Amino acid sequence: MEIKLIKGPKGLGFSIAGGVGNQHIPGDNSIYVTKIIEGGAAHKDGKLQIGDKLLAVNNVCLEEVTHEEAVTALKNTSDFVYLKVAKPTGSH
């Protein structure tokens, strides 16, 4: 699930979690949104909602990185931001 968010003066307008020691979900060290601010990029978009995981962002994978990388990649937005979200399914 990809979403083409346009970088605005305000910013992202939400929060995230990610990585060992700072994981958002047990068993998954991916980057998940923990709190979306009103009138924010995600909030306004509607596609991104609490519980989603960040597969990749700007060509980089956000599923095997620490929290620093989760924030560094979310903050690494120039004109546009290509967010890649993975669909949670699992086998077990």
Partner: peptide, 6 residues
């Protein structure tokens, strides 16, 4: 666990 805003 750590949750930071961005």
């Amino acid at each position: 666990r750590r949750e930071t805003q961005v």
